[PDB]
Design an enzyme around this catalytic site. Structure first.
Site, PDB file in Angstrom:
ATOM      1  CB  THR B  67      69.247  28.963  69.052  1.00  0.00           C
ATOM      2  OG1 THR B  67      68.742  30.091  68.338  1.00  0.00           O
ATOM      3  CG2 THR B  67      69.738  29.370  70.498  1.00  0.00           C
ATOM      4  CG  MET B  68      73.061  29.622  64.122  1.00  0.00           C
ATOM      5  SD  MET B  68      74.807  29.523  64.591  1.00  0.00           S
ATOM      6  CE  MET B  68      75.215  27.952  63.884  1.00  0.00           C
ATOM      7  CG  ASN B  94      71.216  27.277  54.138  1.00  0.00           C
ATOM      8  OD1 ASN B  94      70.880  27.634  53.011  1.00  0.00           O
ATOM      9  ND2 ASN B  94      70.462  26.463  54.890  1.00  0.00           N
ATOM     10  CB  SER B 145      67.501  36.412  49.229  1.00  0.00           C
ATOM     11  OG  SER B 145      66.262  36.845  48.705  1.00  0.00           O
ATOM     12  CE1 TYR B 158      65.506  35.986  54.248  1.00  0.00           C
ATOM     13  CE2 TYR B 158      64.956  37.368  52.370  1.00  0.00           C
ATOM     14  CZ  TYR B 158      65.462  36.187  52.878  1.00  0.00           C
ATOM     15  OH  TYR B 158      65.933  35.227  52.019  1.00  0.00           O
ATOM     16  CB  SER B 161      69.350  40.419  57.790  1.00  0.00           C
ATOM     17  OG  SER B 161      68.579  39.458  57.082  1.00  0.00           O
TER      18      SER B 161
HETATM   19  N1  LIG Z   1      63.363  29.116  49.915  1.00  0.00           N
HETATM   20  C1  LIG Z   1      63.489  30.202  49.133  1.00  0.00           C
HETATM   21  O1  LIG Z   1      62.655  30.498  48.294  1.00  0.00           O
HETATM   22  C2  LIG Z   1      64.689  31.101  49.329  1.00  0.00           C
HETATM   23  C3  LIG Z   1      64.870  32.159  48.438  1.00  0.00           C
HETATM   24  C4  LIG Z   1      65.975  32.989  48.542  1.00  0.00           C
HETATM   25  C5  LIG Z   1      66.909  32.769  49.525  1.00  0.00           C
HETATM   26  N2  LIG Z   1      66.760  31.750  50.391  1.00  0.00           N
HETATM   27  C6  LIG Z   1      67.801  31.523  51.456  1.00  0.00           C
HETATM   28  O2  LIG Z   1      68.161  30.189  51.478  1.00  0.00           O
HETATM   29  C7  LIG Z   1      68.493  29.772  52.822  1.00  0.00           C
HETATM   30  C8  LIG Z   1      67.715  28.522  53.162  1.00  0.00           C
HETATM   31  O3  LIG Z   1      66.293  28.779  53.054  1.00  0.00           O
HETATM   32  P1  LIG Z   1      65.237  27.579  53.170  1.00  0.00           P
HETATM   33  O4  LIG Z   1      64.053  27.938  52.356  1.00  0.00           O
HETATM   34  O5  LIG Z   1      65.902  26.281  52.907  1.00  0.00           O
HETATM   35  O6  LIG Z   1      64.837  27.654  54.715  1.00  0.00           O
HETATM   36  P2  LIG Z   1      64.141  26.561  55.655  1.00  0.00           P
HETATM   37  O7  LIG Z   1      63.687  25.329  54.968  1.00  0.00           O
HETATM   38  O8  LIG Z   1      63.102  27.232  56.500  1.00  0.00           O
HETATM   39  O9  LIG Z   1      65.328  26.254  56.678  1.00  0.00           O
HETATM   40  C9  LIG Z   1      65.879  27.180  57.640  1.00  0.00           C
HETATM   41  C10 LIG Z   1      66.941  26.424  58.396  1.00  0.00           C
HETATM   42  O10 LIG Z   1      67.539  27.266  59.418  1.00  0.00           O
HETATM   43  C11 LIG Z   1      67.378  26.651  60.686  1.00  0.00           C
HETATM   44  N3  LIG Z   1      67.187  27.688  61.693  1.00  0.00           N
HETATM   45  C12 LIG Z   1      66.051  28.429  61.902  1.00  0.00           C
HETATM   46  N4  LIG Z   1      66.118  29.232  62.932  1.00  0.00           N
HETATM   47  C13 LIG Z   1      67.385  28.996  63.449  1.00  0.00           C
HETATM   48  C14 LIG Z   1      68.053  29.496  64.585  1.00  0.00           C
HETATM   49  N5  LIG Z   1      67.534  30.417  65.409  1.00  0.00           N
HETATM   50  N6  LIG Z   1      69.285  29.003  64.857  1.00  0.00           N
HETATM   51  C15 LIG Z   1      69.803  28.079  64.044  1.00  0.00           C
HETATM   52  N7  LIG Z   1      69.275  27.551  62.933  1.00  0.00           N
HETATM   53  C16 LIG Z   1      68.056  28.052  62.692  1.00  0.00           C
HETATM   54  C17 LIG Z   1      66.188  25.708  60.521  1.00  0.00           C
HETATM   55  O11 LIG Z   1      66.175  24.604  61.446  1.00  0.00           O
HETATM   56  P3  LIG Z   1      65.519  24.721  62.893  1.00  0.00           P
HETATM   57  O12 LIG Z   1      64.146  25.352  62.791  1.00  0.00           O
HETATM   58  O13 LIG Z   1      65.346  23.244  63.279  1.00  0.00           O
HETATM   59  O14 LIG Z   1      66.454  25.486  63.761  1.00  0.00           O
HETATM   60  C18 LIG Z   1      66.412  25.180  59.110  1.00  0.00           C
HETATM   61  O15 LIG Z   1      67.333  24.097  59.104  1.00  0.00           O
HETATM   62  C19 LIG Z   1      68.206  30.992  53.694  1.00  0.00           C
HETATM   63  O16 LIG Z   1      69.415  31.726  53.900  1.00  0.00           O
HETATM   64  C20 LIG Z   1      67.192  31.748  52.840  1.00  0.00           C
HETATM   65  O17 LIG Z   1      67.250  33.158  52.988  1.00  0.00           O
HETATM   66  C21 LIG Z   1      65.641  30.899  50.313  1.00  0.00           C
HETATM   67  O1  LIG Z   2      64.245  35.444  49.832  1.00  0.00           O
HETATM   68  C1  LIG Z   2      63.320  34.948  49.212  1.00  0.00           C
HETATM   69  C2  LIG Z   2      62.469  33.882  49.861  1.00  0.00           C
HETATM   70  C3  LIG Z   2      61.444  34.370  50.929  1.00  0.00           C
HETATM   71  C4  LIG Z   2      60.603  35.463  50.177  1.00  0.00           C
HETATM   72  C5  LIG Z   2      59.442  35.125  49.483  1.00  0.00           C
HETATM   73  C6  LIG Z   2      58.771  36.065  48.717  1.00  0.00           C
HETATM   74  C7  LIG Z   2      59.244  37.359  48.630  1.00  0.00           C
HETATM   75  C8  LIG Z   2      60.381  37.717  49.318  1.00  0.00           C
HETATM   76  C9  LIG Z   2      61.053  36.782  50.090  1.00  0.00           C
HETATM   77  C10 LIG Z   2      60.565  33.180  51.423  1.00  0.00           C
HETATM   78  C11 LIG Z   2      59.518  33.661  52.439  1.00  0.00           C
HETATM   79  C12 LIG Z   2      60.207  34.266  53.666  1.00  0.00           C
HETATM   80  C13 LIG Z   2      61.086  35.437  53.220  1.00  0.00           C
HETATM   81  C14 LIG Z   2      62.133  34.947  52.204  1.00  0.00           C
HETATM   82  C15 LIG Z   2      62.996  33.878  52.892  1.00  0.00           C
HETATM   83  C16 LIG Z   2      62.124  32.704  53.337  1.00  0.00           C
HETATM   84  C17 LIG Z   2      61.425  32.113  52.112  1.00  0.00           C
HETATM   85  C18 LIG Z   2      61.081  33.206  54.333  1.00  0.00           C
HETATM   86  O2  LIG Z   2      60.278  32.133  54.806  1.00  0.00           O
HETATM   87  N1  LIG Z   2      63.023  35.325  47.950  1.00  0.00           N
HETATM   88  C19 LIG Z   2      62.032  34.884  46.968  1.00  0.00           C
HETATM   89  C20 LIG Z   2      62.306  36.201  46.191  1.00  0.00           C
HETATM   90  O3  LIG Z   2      62.740  35.987  44.856  1.00  0.00           O
HETATM   91  C21 LIG Z   2      63.556  36.390  47.101  1.00  0.00           C
END
Ligand SMILES: NC(=O)c1ccc[n+]([C@@H]2O[C@H](COP(=O)([O-])OP(=O)(O)OC[C@H]3O[C@@H](n4cnc5c(N)ncnc54)[C@H](OP(=O)(O)O)[C@@H]3O)[C@@H](O)[C@H]2O)c1
Ligand SMILES: O=C(C[C@]1(c2ccccc2)[C@H]2C[C@H]3C[C@@H]1C[C@@H](C2)[C@@H]3O)N1CC(O)C1
Ligand SMILES: NC(=O)c1ccc[n+]([C@@H]2O[C@H](COP(=O)([O-])OP(=O)(O)OC[C@H]3O[C@@H](n4cnc5c(N)ncnc54)[C@H](OP(=O)(O)O)[C@@H]3O)[C@@H](O)[C@H]2O)c1
Ligand SMILES: O=C(C[C@]1(c2ccccc2)[C@H]2C[C@H]3C[C@@H]1C[C@@H](C2)[C@@H]3O)N1CC(O)C1
Lengths: 278, 263
Positions: B67-68, B94, B145, B158, B161
């Site tokens: 865990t981070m 990430n 993001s 979020y 951060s």
């Molecule tokens: N998906 C989107 O639409 C979106 C949009 C904008 C930005 N982002 C950014 O992209 C990145 C990846 O997002 P994602 O959608 O791929 O997320 P995701 O599928 O939910 O994956 C999150 C990852 O972080 C790990 N994690 C969670 N809690 C943790 C903890 N306490 N310690 C260590 N590792 C931990 C999870 O694994 P475990 O649960 O097994 O620990 C998993 O591998 C993030 O920085 C997110 O903000 C995503």
């Molecule tokens: O940052 C993200 C993705 C997330 C989100 C989803 C809609 C609105 C805000 C944030 C997803 C839902 C929550 C908050 C955050 C990070 C992940 C995926 C988390 O599960 N976005 C998409 C927008 O363009 C910027």
């Protein structure tokens, strides 16, 4: 008072400030023992507001309260403590509100002591900057929100140009100021859709001639500093006028370039897109 | 111009790599022939990523689970990951703490945990990795993001951060430039991505065009390999048109002149 009634804020009150807008208003100013904080307390006293000031130093706060009363403050009090202590932060608001019989404006201005340095491994300073500069502001906001809701009050968050653009030698500080923008701008959107009539003012300041800032920059950064007295008044005006952001700096270039119209356009485009009534 | 050969034999850490964007990055990396060390909390999901990585073409593939939330694990993880690979070329930050869409009321616990996991652990990982990245003239890739550049309701903690990441990493990028530290820093600004977590969290709150995770993951790697300051990836043409802030870059340039760096 019982035979008196009306409102100071009518036509033009979103554009033109008058010191009468603060007359009888109940205001908290944090980090108010010196610098910009102390100057804001002084302007508030002069306008006829009730004030509660805080900082760690009991002695310095006593002097601010004494001078506030001389200036014509409706009432002036202090509560001393550290914003490293989240329990103090939470309890401080409860006391201050009881002391005035409510709250109209919460001015969040304190920071942890910060010097200019290249970042190497000071995680302790990174964590303390996040706790004092950011987390305590969130704690103070939570504690104050019920009173601010009753008065349709205002939150004023003192930030920096280093909270909008990158500057070397202030990585932890800058992280905490950027965090304030992210947090408070998000809750401002929530309040809008939730019909919470509490305004949020983010103050973006350039270099100000406070003793702390002048000492810290000495021989490292060579910038023009703006006067603290004028800075302090512009923060109050923005708050009283319920402006989303206040910008205050010595440079005409800064005021010309600091605004981000593309951010405002993106927020408007995204504003419809979500179903928040759930 | 990016070429997959740029990652061949490179030593890469990918955090939060058990699923979503992180897992897809591990895959594009393994394909390109890199040595990879993946992390997340789930041992069982990480094992599957390591297996599929080796199949795709990775020079070596390992996992370290933890865990981070734990700064000691964060610091020790980088040293152990570095020992396994005999160095480090790219640090991909990430992971986020599990987050759902909600109005902010009084959840200070979520605010503190978001700052600890999403931001502080990235700073801890960077400090632990910097000596190795300095030796290789490496790269730091910070996954952010659109909510780390503009305001969004229902993600206050979020968003705070993600904004903090921009403030911190853009400041140290200026410091590295003047200090002649040849370590690049890439801030990735992402829109909605079709990860299982995001598609579940947004359900009934938003019906946008979910950008594909595979392409997202590659664009992050490309930006890092090309040493770009910022990467923007979203489905909307209007986002790519408005997300940039040239006035911030002009202001930063004007303010650089005020510094005495020969100290
Ligand atoms: N998906 C989107 O639409 C979106 C949009 C904008 C930005 N982002 C950014 O992209 C990145 C990846 O997002 P994602 O959608 O791929 O997320 P995701 O599928 O939910 O994956 C999150 C990852 O972080 C790990 N994690 C969670 N809690 C943790 C903890 N306490 N310690 C260590 N590792 C931990 C999870 O694994 P475990 O649960 O097994 O620990 C998993 O591998 C993030 O920085 C997110 O903000 C995503
Ligand atoms: O940052 C993200 C993705 C997330 C989100 C989803 C809609 C609105 C805000 C944030 C997803 C839902 C929550 C908050 C955050 C990070 C992940 C995926 C988390 O599960 N976005 C998409 C927008 O363009 C910027
Ligand atoms: N001056 C500038 O150039 C400038 C520029 C941009 C932004 N700003 C912002 O303006 C605000 C005020 O700055 P300033 O220059 O006026 O600073 P200042 O003169 O150094 O004042 C700091 C204030 O906060 C208090 N404080 C310090 N540590 C504290 C703690 N642990 N808990 C509670 N209170 C604490 C101090 O008194 P005690 O030590 O007794 O507690 C004092 O009242 C800050 O938010 C700063 O970021 C200033
Ligand atoms: O935020 C501030 C003022 C400070 C500063 C001073 C030069 C460079 C960066 C930060 C002063 C010195 C440190 C860091 C920070 C806050 C205070 C005063 C602290 O003592 N600025 C000035 C710039 O326009 C935005």
């Amino acid at each position: 008072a019982s035979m008196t009634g009306g409102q100071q804020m009518g036509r033009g009150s979103n554009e033109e400030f008058r010191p009468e807008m603060l007359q009888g208003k109940k205001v908290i100013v944090t980090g108010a023992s010196k610098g910009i904080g102390r100057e804001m307390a002084y302007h508030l006293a002069k306008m006829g507001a009730h004030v509660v000031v805080t900082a760690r130093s009991k002695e310095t706060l006593q002097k601010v309260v004494s001078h506030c009363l001389e200036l014509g403050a409706a009432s002036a009090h202090y509560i001393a403590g550290t914003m490293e202590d989240m329990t103090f932060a939470e309890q401080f608001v409860a006391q201050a509100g009881k002391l005035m019989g409510g709250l109209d404006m919460l001015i969040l201005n304190h920071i942890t002591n910060t010097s200019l340095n290249l970042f190497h491994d000071d995680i302790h300073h990174v964590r303390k900057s996040m706790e004092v500069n950011f987390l305590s502001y969130v704690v103070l906001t939570v504690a104050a929100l019920p009173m601010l809701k009753q008065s349709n009050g205002s939150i004023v968050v003192v930030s920096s140009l280093a909270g909008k653009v990158a500057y070397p030698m202030v990585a932890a500080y800058s992280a905490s100021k950027f965090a304030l923008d992210g947090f408070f701008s998000s809750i401002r959107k929530e309040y809008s859709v939730s019909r919470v009539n509490v305004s949020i003012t983010l103050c973006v300041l350039g270099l100000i001639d406070t003793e702390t800032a002048m000492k810290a920059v000495s021989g490292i950064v060579h910038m023009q500093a703006a006067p603290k007295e004028e800075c302090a008044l512009e923060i109050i005006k923005g708050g009283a006028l319920r402006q989303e952001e206040v910008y205050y700096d010595s440079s005409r270039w800064t005021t010309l370039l600091i605004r981000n119209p593309c951010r405002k356009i993106l927020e408007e485009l995204y504003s419809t897109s979500y179903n928040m009534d759930r």
